[PDB]
Structure formats: structure tokens, C-alpha cells
Amino acid sequence: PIETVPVKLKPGMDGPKVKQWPLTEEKIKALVEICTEMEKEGKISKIGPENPYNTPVFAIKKKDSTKWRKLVDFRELNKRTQDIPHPAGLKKKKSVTVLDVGDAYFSVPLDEDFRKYTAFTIPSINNETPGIRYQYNVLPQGWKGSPAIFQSSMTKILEPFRKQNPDIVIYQYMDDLYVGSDLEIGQHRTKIEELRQHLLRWGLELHPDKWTVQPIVLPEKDSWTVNDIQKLVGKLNWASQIYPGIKVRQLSKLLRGTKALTEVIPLTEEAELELAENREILKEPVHGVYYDPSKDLIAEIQKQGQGQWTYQIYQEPFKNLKTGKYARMRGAHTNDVKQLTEAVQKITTESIVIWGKTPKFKLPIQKETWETWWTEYWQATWIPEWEFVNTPPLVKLWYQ
Amino acid sequence: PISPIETVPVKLKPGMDGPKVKQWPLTEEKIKALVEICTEMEKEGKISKIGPENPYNTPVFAIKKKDSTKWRKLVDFRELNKRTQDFWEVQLGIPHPAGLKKKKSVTVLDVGDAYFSVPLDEDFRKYTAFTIPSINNETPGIRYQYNVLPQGWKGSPAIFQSSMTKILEPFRKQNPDIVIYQYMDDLYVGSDLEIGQHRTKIEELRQHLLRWGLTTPDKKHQKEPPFLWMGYELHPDKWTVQPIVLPEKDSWTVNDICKLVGKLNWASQIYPGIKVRQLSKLLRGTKALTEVIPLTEEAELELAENREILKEPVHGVYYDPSKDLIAEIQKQGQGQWTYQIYQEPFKNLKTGKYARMRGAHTNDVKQLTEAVQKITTESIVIWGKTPKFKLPIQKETWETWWTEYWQATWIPEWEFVNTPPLVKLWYQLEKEPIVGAETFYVDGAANRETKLGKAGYVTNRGRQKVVTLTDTTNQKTELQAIYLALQDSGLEVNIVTDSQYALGIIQAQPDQSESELVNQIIEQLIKKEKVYLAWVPAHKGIGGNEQVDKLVSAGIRK
DNA sequence: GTCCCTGTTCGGGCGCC
DNA sequence: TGGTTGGCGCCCGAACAGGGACTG
Ligand SMILES: *[PH](O)(O)OC[C@@]1(C#C)O[C@@H](n2cnc3c(N)nc(F)nc32)C[C@@H]1O[PH](O)(O)OC[C@@]1(C#C)O[C@@H](n2cnc3c(N)nc(F)nc32)C[C@@H]1O
Ligand SMILES: [Mg+2]
């Protein structure tokens, strides 16, 4: 039917060989039901152990629906896969809706020589059965090459809608379609449903206006102790690595000698003025920060406690492209891991809308803790890369 | 017979050729057994005679089977395995009897001559060439190649396990309510039918397997409990592990310690309270399995209390999905944790232990969290769900820990149980400076070349002390300085440090460490009533960090 | 750059099938 | 007997990666 496009791995790289992690009974039953239907329609085929590659698979369940979604953790294959103006107006729209257009890829065949690398394995409960393996025959959801090959077909489908609605920005990333407009809520939702009816012929909410930056703030006191000024000097000293205009001469000279931490230090007029000048400098935007599409985005997250989470997105140290906060549930039934997984999704969603790329996360969590529960709270169709850090208690104190 | 299933296409690694190793000398008994096996396998098409057109060879041998009567023909395919393609192993784990659901009727039967009944890829057969000596100087040694899966080849396990899955697929599809646990050639079959109707379903399975060339001999067809399965005995309403025999030595070697700990690990799945920390500690630094290691007093004590656990009768029960999974964790000494998983009180599904030491410095709450994570993952494998936990930690203790700890940490639904020793935090750092407590400014400095160092403090009350160190590091002198301040202060103390390394260790509130210096610091922190630890950036002239920095830098730096 | 001290992974021995 | 293969488990040490501090 459709001529296949030859795709190959990067030079000197083999396919992915990543082990399947344990899946719950509800996820395996969902994956088994999905794979039997996908196999019935020629989308996947069973394979044996002579295929040496493997990529982990799981499933997520949307909030209020008994429908599951098959997720293949393809980011190892995406890195090994051989390699458009990002819409700058998407981040300045009133409402943006995310639509899963992953089903569109299933109508385009995949290069026969490449299907071996799409292998995955369905596990069984209590190892009743060996793992049952499959590979992809069509463009797979979650693969970096799927939106690339389907690019020409996606433009044909979106052409009439984009012409009829020029004030609506439609952007595609992986299996997701981002639709932003300045229409009033309700009118916007009518256009989203209109586009859904448009996508059904072929077959088969975000408010980026309110995304604000969290600047570095400084304490305000009528009475300063030696401890208060020591905490303030160390914070401004770190901040001067980001804002070279920060000076700490008049504040630190108040600490000369060997004093008790609870001793009261009256701020002199010079130290008082130096502090006020530092507050204005911290309001200014970081200078000389230019986004490099060829370098990775790095996202660091700090647990601030009481449901508060701060994060920074940079490519070079102290060159923050964005610094924000993510405050959530403030109770005794708080789930740290759940709030963290939700935080990395919101941060990734923002990075896609702003720069069109997914960031690499430095997660403040034990590796085993994250891998045990992170899939239980995932709701996105993409998965970002992440490493696990042993955070210093210093960066936590700097970003409040 | 030989299965009519399609072969699995297998290639060598690029640029490689088949093995060319010659046969090693064999015993007369070994030879007589191999010719009897090879003559029969040739009559059945399982092996074919080759000639000079085949230039490969691999040494073969034989060992006794578990029944200890028949012989198991093996091939030392180590060279061929290096040059054979990679496989993706399909066996993802070992089934456990605690995950078996209660069935009305149970059968356990094996496929006979499993490997030798699955055909091998025709283009790959010539690489499995071997030579069997016969009655030499009366008839030369016959050269054969394998037409079926050989024992000793890398691909045989995964190819057989996958082939067995394809063969069982139509029967599972037709009989979705017949549970079939498939491990190698062994089949556990369970139904909710009466024993008569169950046996007819078994014969349908046997006929199904026979259609795919897999026999099921009656000698390996178990029909009554207890069933011998995967090293257990399956009774109708309970299961037990086959008897475990610990070594009986007076001069334990490293090999004996491995067999001891290995069998104890295997016993901990149903025997509660097994501990292997002191025994496994005896292996730190050893090199040879023959080294006789003298048992320490607590290692011999640990062995003695394990023996008493194994002398008790113990059994497990089967899984009822309509009830919840409950995991209860008991704290043992020195980072050791045992647990029991059950659904009805005093009816363990299984037990287990956890004692993996993670991190140089940790506390009992961190380890309990790690044990919960391990039990959760292990529960998802066996049962497909997370258990409800019963933990010997106060709700307030957990609230205090996850409040101050900078990492994301979480424990699923859990209820407190008063089973001492309870898990608690042995000290707490103040959030604010302490009024009326002496303020210590600590610092250390070490010389990278000479390894000489200095640690000390200055206080707001005029006290100062400097201690010289040898064979130290900058990081150690910073910890020595904090330790020095703790020793020379009262029950309440403010400490200011410039070392975020030392600050990060102490804020995590460890109660145990691999470092003796950190352990001495922990012991001081427990004796204190109030400690406040603060941080200042180094080399910035912030008093009195500036004063102590000049004291410890003199003579070792600049 | 190096040294230090973390962290994880991999492969060795043993255990079990 | 000794000499094979694969899965999983445990515990160990070697071999890495990543971040912070150090030298003149
Ligand atoms: P438990 O209740 O004792 O069950 C025994 C059994 C099963 C099922 O567990 C497997 N097994 C036990 N010990 C094994 C070793 N050392 N290696 C391998 F690969 N498997 C082992 C097999 C065993 O069932 P059994 O009926 O003995 O043999 C069946 C078979 C198959 C399929 O496994 C292979 N096999 C058995 N012993 C082997 C040895 N020592 N080496 C190799 F390479 N392969 C072995 C061949 C058989 O056809
Ligand atoms: Mg210092």
C-alpha cells in the first residue's frame, strides 16, 4: 500500500536491551487485551528470543474512564535512532488543549529492517508463563521517528482547519497535539471538539498565559540575628553566581568577630541599602541566557516541604531559562512520589510548549523508590529522561 | 517424537565460525552410556551422522540425572556459545507457591525428553558437531550433529521456553479457566472442576501436547497430593518447602559459608526470623573458597538461632484474591529486617528478609523504607498488587522524617504495630539557633600531597582548640572538627560549618555508618539535648569561620 | 586537571529450579 | 565424580559516573 521509509540507528549503536520491570495485574490484563487487538489488526506480531532487543512496556489508565493506554518506554530507542520552527506563539495563548493523536501512526507501515528494535515483552503474574514478546509492524506510539515519518500526512489533515482558524496554533510533539487559542473558554472547547470531528474523518487544560517565574526572594525582618545574617550572606553569595551584581560587602562586615548565633545585629544604613539594592537585582532577568537546541535541557527539582516544589530549567550552570514553583497538597496524607511525578509532567509539559523539547530531570529521590511507584501516577504519552541525585540542602534553602 | 513446530532461526555472530575443539578422554562407563543414547537419537532423527563435509567438533560428556539412574548427555559448547548470536531470555523469574490460587483439582506432570523433542534450525545444525568413540580399533568413533536442542548450548533454554509457550497457546486460548504453570518441561495444571471432569481436561492437554510432539510419561504424572513442584510439596490447603539441610562443620571455609548463607536465604521464604548479616560479614575481603574462616562470637550466635528456627515445623498457604495482602515487618539488629506476608492472621503466605546495606550512612527509617520498596516490588511479581503494610514505626516518627528529609520518600497504606524494637529517630537537629548554647565555628583543612591535616574550632566564649591529623582528607578534617566541637561542648550547642559534605551527612540523621568517625559523631549527637548545625560559605571572611580557617590552615596550606 | 566520596552496575562465588 | 546451559535469589568487590573541593 504505502511505500516504507528506510530508517536506521545512529552509527556505532546497537538496539535497546532494557529489561521489563514488574507490572501489576491490572496493567498486564490491560496490555494483554490491547495486544490481542493490535495483533488481530496486523499492528504487532509475535517474536521469539532470537530477537536480542527489548524495550519495557506498561499501561496507564485515564482519570474517569475504564480505557487503558499502552505506553512503550522508547526513550532508549529514541536516543539510538537517527535524527521545523517551534511555534513561539503557543506559550502566549489563553487556553491550550492536549490531544492524543497516537492512533494516527497505526496506518503507516514501518521499515522491515527496523521492526526488530521495537521489541517488547509482556510479563506474567507469578511467572506462570515466560514473557510473551512482540514487535511493531506500523509506526509505534512513543518512537521519535513516528511523528517525523507521519509529518507529510499530518500537514494534509491539519491544512483546512489551520486555514479556517488562523488564530489557532496547532503544535505536535510525539503522540501529542497541542492546540492553543485566545478564544473564551467554551468557544475554545467548541473548536477542540470541532477539530476532534475533523480528525475522525481521516481516523482512526493548559493556560500558558499564567505560567509565571518564581524569582529569588530575600527575607524581611525588623530584628536580625547573627544566624539570620549568616543565612542571608550565604544565600546572596550563591545568588551572585547567577546575578553578578549582587554584593555582600556591607552585610558580611557586620559579622566580624566570633559571635553567638542568637545575638542581635542592627543593620547599618550601608548594610540596609546594600540589601535593598540586592532585592532589585534579583528581580532583573538573568542575562546572557540563550536556548541551544543541540544541548540538553536540565531540570532540577527541590522538595521544599508542605507540598511545595521548586524547579529550574537550564543548559549551562547558573544560566536558568526558567525558575518556577509547584505547590500542591498540604496535608498528612501527602504522597511525595505522586507529587514528584506530577511535577515532572507539568515541567515537561511546559518545556514542550516553550522550547519543543523534553528536559532531562535530576530527581531528588532514591532510584528504587521512583521505579517502584512512578508509573502509578503517570498520565502523559511521552517519558522524559531522568537521573537520580543526592541533593545538597543548600539549593533547597536558596530557592526558598 | 520431534515437534512439528517451526524452528527458531539462529545465526552466529558476524565474522565467526563454528567451534573446532576435540573430544577429551572419557571413562568406559561414560562411553557405553553415550553410544546407547546416540544410537537411539539417530534412529529417531534427533541426531544425524556427518562425515568430512563437517569440519566442526565440540567435546561432550554426561552426568547422572536427579532420578540418578538415566544419564544426561551434555555438551561443553562454551566456545560455540561465545560465537552464537545474542538472545533475549524469555524466562523472567521463578514461580512461587504463595502466588498459586486455590484450585479444586491439581495435576503436576512433565514433558519427557524436552530439549530433544524441539527441532533445531536446519542452517545451524552443523555447528553442533560432536564425535562419540565406540569400540575403537574394531569400529571408529561416529560423528553426529544435533537436529534438536542440545544441552549446553546458550540458545536452548530460551528457544525451548518460547517454543513451549507457542505450543500451549491454543490450549490456553480454548481453556482460559485452566491455569497452567509452565516452568521448563514441568506443568502445574489447576482447575475448578470435579476430579473426574478435571482428568478429562488433563487428557485433552496431553493429547494437545502429543499433537505437537511432546510426550507426558505417566512416571512423571502426579495425581495425588502432596505434589512435588519447584522444590516444594503442594498439599490441598497448604504448602511446604522440601527439607533444608544446613552444613555440619567445625572449621567453616568460604565455600561452606556460601552454602550456609545460600541455604539460609532459600529458607527465609517460609522460615521467619532468618539472619545472615554476621555470617556474610565473614566474607568481606576473602579470595579463595578454601579459606577456613573462623566464626565470630555473634556469627556463631547467629548460626545457632537460625538452626533453632529451622527445627520448627512451618508451612505456607495459597493466595485468595478476594482478600487483602498484609505485610508485617519486624526489625532485627544491625540493619536486618524480616517480614511475613499473609491474608489471615497467623497464616503466612510466605516470609522473607531484608538486610542489604545501602549507602555509607543511613538510619533505621531509611532502611525500613527500602524494605517496604523491596516487599512491594516482590509482591507485584508474585501477586500483581501491593500489600497493606504493618510497620513497627509510630505515625509521628514517619511524619517527622518525611517533613525534614529533602528527598521524596513515601510508604503505602500502613498501620502501626507495637512489635519492638520500634523504629525511631535517635536525635533531631534544631531548626533555629539555640539561645544560651555555646556557638562553635568549626573548620578543617588537609594537604593533598603530605596528607597532613588540622581540625578545630573557635567559640564565641573565647575557647579554641586545634588538633593535628595524619593520613587524612579535607572531608575528614571537616568531620573531625565537628566531632571535636561535640566532644568539648555542653548538652546544647550551636555549630557553624563551611562543609556541605559534612552538613549533608548529619542532616540526614544517620544512626549507623561504615565510617568510625561518623559513628563517633552519631554517638555524641544522641547524648546531646539540642544541636543546631548551620552552614556558611568557606573562604569569605565570615566570622568566626574566618578565625578558625586561619587556625587550621596554618602549617598545612599556602 | 586531581583527589575524595558518594552513588549504581556488573560479574564472581554460592543457593534454588 | 570431575568438564555445559538459562532463569531467579543473596552478598561481595571491581569499575565505573557525578559532584564538590583543592593548588599556586
Ligand atoms: P525441580 O522441581 O527440581 O524441577 C527440575 C527442573 C524443571 C522443571 O528444573 C530445571 N533444572 C533444574 N536444574 C537445572 C539446571 N542445572 N539447568 C537447567 F537448564 N535446568 C535445570 C530442569 C528440571 O527438569 P528436568 O526434567 O530435569 O530437565 C528438563 C530440561 C528441559 C526443558 O531442562 C534441561 N536441563 C535439565 N538439566 C540441565 C542441565 N544440568 N544442563 C542443561 F544445559 N540443561 C538442563 C534439559 C531438559 O530437557
Ligand atoms: Mg572548611
Side-chain angles (χ1 to χ4, degrees):
Chain A
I2 299 98
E3 186 68 38
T4 179
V5 179
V7 184
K8 62 181 183 297
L9 301 174
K10 292 185 176 175
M13 295 182 190
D14 199 19
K17 294 184 179 177
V18 187
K19 310 231 301 180
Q20 176 63 44
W21 58 70
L23 297 184
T24 58
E25 169 154 49
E26 62 180 27
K27 289 190 183 65
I28 297 183
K29 283 190 175 182
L31 285 177
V32 166
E33 187 207 279
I34 290 178
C35 285
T36 54
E37 189 181 2
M38 293 186 69
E39 168 175 51
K40 190 263 292 294
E41 306 168 21
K43 299 167 175 178
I44 59 178
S45 289
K46 286 194 176 63
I47 56 176
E50 82 277 14
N51 183 321
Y53 311 105
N54 189 71
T55 281
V57 61
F58 65 104
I60 60 173
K61 185 179 181 178
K62 302 303 174 177
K63 42 169 185 296
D64 288 330
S65 182
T66 60
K67 296 178 178 178
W68 289 81
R69 218 282 194 176
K70 169 172 171 287
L71 265 176
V72 190
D73 179 18
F74 264 143
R75 56 206 152 108
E76 190 64 27
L77 174 66
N78 292 329
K79 288 164 57 179
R80 304 159 181 266
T81 302
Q82 196 80 93
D83 311 279
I84 53 97
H86 173 70
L90 183 69
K91 62 178 174 296
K92 55 191 64 177
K93 286 291 180 292
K94 270 63 171 299
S95 304
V96 176
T97 306
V98 186
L99 283 75
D100 179 22
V101 297
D103 291 332
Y105 303 118
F106 290 166
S107 60
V108 180
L110 182 64
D111 182 33
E112 227 297 294
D113 298 29
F114 199 80
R115 303 187 178 179
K116 60 181 70 171
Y117 307 119
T118 65
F120 62 95
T121 308
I122 301 297
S124 69
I125 304 157
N126 200 20
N127 293 283
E128 181 193 311
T129 306
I132 297 177
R133 292 167 50 73
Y134 293 93
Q135 77 180 17
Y136 265 95
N137 293 322
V138 295
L139 296 182
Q141 302 169 127
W143 177 50
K144 125 191 173 187
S146 294
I149 303 306
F150 198 72
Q151 176 64 37
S152 298
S153 304
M154 184 63 69
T155 58
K156 307 174 185 174
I157 303 182
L158 300 176
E159 208 294 281
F161 195 89
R162 286 171 167 168
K163 184 230 63 179
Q164 187 78 11
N165 302 269
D167 296 325
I168 294 186
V169 176
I170 297 179
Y171 170 65
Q172 177 180 3
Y173 182 82
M174 298 302 175
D175 317 332
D176 286 10
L177 204 64
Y178 292 83
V179 188
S181 83
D182 312 282
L183 295 173
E184 190 177 26
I185 175 176
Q187 299 165 355
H188 170 89
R189 296 169 170 178
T190 299
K191 287 299 175 178
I192 301 301
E193 183 51 36
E194 176 180 340
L195 181 57
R196 267 194 168 269
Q197 294 301 321
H198 193 317
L199 296 181
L200 277 178
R201 302 191 199 95
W202 273 256
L204 185 63
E205 319 198 86
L206 268 52
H207 304 289
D209 268 18
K210 310 305 177 180
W211 290 356
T212 182
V213 288
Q214 182 69 33
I216 306 169
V217 75
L218 296 181
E220 298 175 332
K221 297 168 174 293
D222 315 325
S223 184
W224 299 81
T225 58
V226 172
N227 181 247
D228 290 327
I229 301 179
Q230 279 178 355
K231 286 165 57 182
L232 178 68
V233 167
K235 180 179 182 175
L236 288 171
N237 178 69
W238 162 89
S240 61
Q241 294 176 311
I242 303 177
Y243 302 86
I246 301 293
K247 68 191 188 72
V248 73
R249 267 312 192 103
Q250 301 304 320
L251 285 171
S252 54
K253 67 166 54 179
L254 297 169
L255 301 174
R256 285 197 184 101
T258 314
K259 298 177 172 300
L261 293 189
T262 63
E263 185 183 284
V264 179
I265 304 298
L267 296 191
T268 63
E269 193 275 339
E270 288 75 15
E272 199 69 271
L273 193 65
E274 180 183 75
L275 178 60
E277 297 170 356
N278 289 330
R279 290 193 176 95
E280 295 299 83
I281 296 181
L282 297 179
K283 297 171 182 173
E284 301 170 0
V286 188
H287 191 259
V289 185
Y290 299 92
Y291 171 68
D292 188 324
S294 75
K295 289 191 284 186
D296 281 341
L297 292 175
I298 300 178
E300 294 194 21
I301 307 179
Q302 298 86 38
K303 173 188 171 185
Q304 298 293 348
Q306 315 306 96
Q308 311 291 305
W309 300 84
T310 58
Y311 63 94
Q312 306 85 45
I313 304 177
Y314 61 94
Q315 298 179 324
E316 301 295 332
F318 317 110
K319 268 66 186 58
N320 292 331
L321 291 154
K322 189 186 189 304
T323 62
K325 75 171 179 181
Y326 182 77
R328 294 287 289 183
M329 183 191 296
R330 314 157 91 267
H333 316 87
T334 301
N335 186 336
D336 266 1
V337 180
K338 178 193 185 62
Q339 290 182 336
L340 183 58
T341 64
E342 295 171 349
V344 309
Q345 287 171 92
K346 181 66 193 300
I347 294 162
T348 306
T349 296
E350 293 182 359
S351 306
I352 294 166
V353 174
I354 298 173
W355 302 282
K357 190 193 290 185
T358 184
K360 186 178 182 62
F361 282 82
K362 292 181 176 183
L363 299 181
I365 187 176
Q366 183 185 49
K367 177 165 187 290
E368 322 287 357
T369 309
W370 175 265
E371 299 173 332
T372 306
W373 287 290
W374 79 272
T375 65
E376 195 63 23
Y377 319 105
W378 202 256
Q379 285 294 309
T381 62
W382 32 251
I383 308 176
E385 299 189 38
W386 52 61
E387 42 175 288
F388 308 95
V389 76
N390 295 92
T391 324
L394 287 312
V395 185
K396 155 193 174 178
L397 292 181
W398 309 147
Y399 295 105
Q400 152 201 267
Chain B
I2 300 183
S3 182
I5 192 182
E6 298 96 290
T7 61
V8 177
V10 164
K11 298 186 301 299
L12 292 180
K13 285 178 172 175
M16 308 286 248
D17 194 28
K20 291 172 180 179
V21 186
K22 292 297 166 290
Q23 184 65 52
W24 54 57
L26 295 173
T27 320
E28 154 65 18
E29 168 178 76
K30 300 289 188 177
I31 294 176
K32 189 192 301 295
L34 289 170
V35 299
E36 180 186 354
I37 297 178
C38 289
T39 42
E40 187 61 29
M41 296 182 67
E42 197 280 332
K43 291 180 56 184
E44 307 174 307
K46 298 179 176 176
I47 61 175
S48 294
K49 300 184 179 182
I50 62 183
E53 61 276 352
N54 197 325
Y56 311 109
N57 186 81
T58 305
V60 296
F61 60 109
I63 56 172
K64 294 273 184 47
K65 289 193 176 184
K66 197 181 182 63
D67 188 84
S68 186
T69 307
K70 296 143 59 183
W71 290 98
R72 163 163 273 107
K73 179 181 187 300
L74 300 178
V75 190
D76 193 352
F77 270 141
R78 274 198 308 251
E79 289 303 317
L80 173 63
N81 294 342
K82 296 175 183 177
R83 320 174 191 187
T84 303
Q85 65 168 84
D86 289 323
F87 294 88
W88 185 263
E89 304 290 338
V90 290
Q91 191 65 35
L92 308 188
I94 314 302
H96 195 270
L100 298 176
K101 298 185 176 182
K102 170 63 181 181
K103 313 306 291 183
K104 188 171 185 56
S105 302
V106 163
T107 304
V108 177
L109 47 78
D110 290 2
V111 172
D113 290 282
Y115 276 13
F116 301 161
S117 293
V118 174
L120 186 65
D121 178 77
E122 286 185 358
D123 294 326
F124 197 82
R125 297 177 179 180
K126 57 174 175 294
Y127 301 143
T128 70
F130 63 96
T131 310
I132 291 291
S134 64
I135 307 181
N136 314 282
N137 286 323
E138 192 171 359
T139 169
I142 313 299
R143 288 179 50 92
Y144 301 99
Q145 76 179 21
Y146 269 94
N147 306 333
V148 287
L149 301 186
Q151 305 189 47
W153 183 48
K154 172 202 291 177
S156 289
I159 287 180
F160 175 84
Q161 291 150 358
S162 185
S163 303
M164 185 70 189
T165 299
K166 284 175 158 55
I167 287 178
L168 291 171
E169 196 275 343
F171 186 90
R172 293 191 165 110
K173 228 72 175 184
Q174 178 177 338
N175 310 273
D177 315 290
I178 308 287
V179 52
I180 298 180
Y181 269 75
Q182 163 209 341
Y183 187 86
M184 301 291 285
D185 65 334
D186 173 86
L187 298 177
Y188 168 100
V189 187
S191 73
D192 292 311
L193 314 166
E194 298 287 357
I195 192 65
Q197 191 177 353
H198 171 86
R199 292 196 169 107
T200 323
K201 233 62 182 180
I202 293 301
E203 286 307 318
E204 173 192 332
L205 176 60
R206 296 188 61 238
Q207 281 287 119
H208 177 80
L209 295 169
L210 184 64
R211 174 261 178 273
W212 291 105
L214 295 182
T215 60
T216 49
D218 197 77
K219 224 289 174 87
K220 285 153 166 293
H221 184 165
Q222 307 185 51
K223 308 175 182 61
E224 302 294 344
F227 303 92
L228 292 184
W229 177 77
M230 298 297 295
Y232 311 94
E233 282 167 306
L234 306 187
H235 297 82
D237 295 281
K238 65 182 181 186
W239 64 269
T240 184
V241 64
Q242 294 181 15
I244 297 181
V245 186
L246 295 185
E248 216 68 270
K249 298 297 178 184
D250 300 333
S251 182
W252 277 272
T253 57
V254 168
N255 191 90
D256 279 328
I257 300 298
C258 296
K259 300 198 300 178
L260 184 61
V261 172
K263 289 197 170 184
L264 286 175
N265 296 327
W266 174 251
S268 68
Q269 67 176 307
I270 196 54
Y271 287 93
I274 301 295
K275 294 188 296 298
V276 303
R277 157 83 63 249
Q278 306 302 328
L279 293 165
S280 302
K281 185 178 300 177
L282 307 182
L283 306 168
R284 303 191 189 181
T286 57
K287 293 289 300 301
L289 294 168
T290 54
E291 304 177 26
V292 38
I293 295 306
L295 268 53
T296 67
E297 284 184 11
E298 46 278 89
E300 209 178 67
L301 194 148
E302 187 181 76
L303 171 64
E305 48 203 16
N306 279 330
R307 294 190 178 277
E308 292 310 307
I309 297 172
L310 294 195
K311 292 171 184 169
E312 298 295 338
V314 79
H315 69 78
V317 296
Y318 300 116
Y319 178 56
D320 178 13
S322 71
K323 307 184 193 308
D324 283 320
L325 282 168
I326 300 179
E328 183 185 345
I329 304 184
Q330 167 66 20
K331 175 188 178 173
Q332 310 278 329
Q334 308 88 30
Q336 293 178 114
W337 307 82
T338 189
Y339 57 93
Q340 318 89 33
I341 302 176
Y342 60 90
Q343 309 185 272
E344 187 171 338
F346 294 90
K347 286 192 174 184
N348 288 337
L349 290 170
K350 69 185 292 297
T351 65
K353 69 180 186 64
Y354 176 78
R356 181 186 182 184
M357 199 55 53
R358 305 186 57 92
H361 329 293
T362 185
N363 56 50
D364 284 334
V365 187
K366 281 183 176 179
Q367 296 175 347
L368 178 61
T369 303
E370 295 155 0
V372 169
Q373 294 162 187
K374 192 61 189 67
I375 295 165
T376 293
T377 294
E378 174 187 342
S379 292
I380 297 183
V381 179
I382 298 176
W383 300 287
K385 57 176 287 183
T386 296
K388 300 175 176 292
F389 285 91
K390 281 174 166 55
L391 307 178
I393 180 178
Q394 300 273 357
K395 286 287 180 177
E396 301 294 339
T397 306
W398 174 251
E399 286 289 323
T400 301
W401 170 248
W402 92 275
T403 292
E404 57 207 355
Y405 195 43
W406 54 81
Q407 284 193 325
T409 182
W410 180 72
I411 295 180
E413 190 197 82
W414 69 277
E415 134 201 4
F416 166 67
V417 288
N418 180 29
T419 53
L422 300 183
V423 177
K424 73 184 187 304
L425 299 164
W426 289 84
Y427 59 90
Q428 292 185 16
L429 303 185
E430 299 297 302
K431 292 159 297 182
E432 301 292 343
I434 311 160
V435 175
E438 190 172 7
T439 296
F440 282 69
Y441 293 87
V442 302
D443 197 14
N447 184 282
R448 161 172 297 186
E449 290 180 32
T450 64
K451 260 61 180 175
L452 296 181
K454 282 183 181 178
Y457 57 80
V458 288
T459 79
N460 67 308
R461 306 185 177 168
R463 295 163 60 198
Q464 72 178 27
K465 180 181 291 183
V466 178
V467 154
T468 54
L469 303 167
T470 316
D471 293 277
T472 185
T473 66
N474 271 279
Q475 298 83 341
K476 286 179 187 179
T477 62
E478 299 281 5
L479 284 173
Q480 291 281 355
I482 287 179
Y483 176 52
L484 201 63
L486 292 166
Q487 290 180 286
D488 303 343
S489 53
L491 297 179
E492 299 182 30
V493 55
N494 300 289
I495 302 176
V496 176
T497 180
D498 60 358
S499 165
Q500 69 188 75
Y501 162 77
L503 179 74
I505 289 174
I506 298 183
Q507 287 198 212
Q509 305 162 233
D511 52 44
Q512 50 190 308
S513 163
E514 312 182 305
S515 163
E516 189 53 88
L517 175 59
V518 179
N519 280 326
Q520 289 168 332
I521 291 175
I522 292 171
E523 179 171 294
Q524 293 292 330
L525 296 169
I526 297 175
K527 299 182 176 183
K528 296 296 185 182
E529 286 185 6
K530 284 200 197 65
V531 180
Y532 177 76
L533 184 56
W535 181 88
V536 292
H539 313 299
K540 299 299 179 176
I542 300 167
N545 170 265
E546 180 206 307
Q547 277 66 61
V548 58
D549 164 68
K550 299 179 180 177
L551 255 53
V552 300
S553 293
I556 76 102
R557 195 146 55 177
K558 311 156 189 176

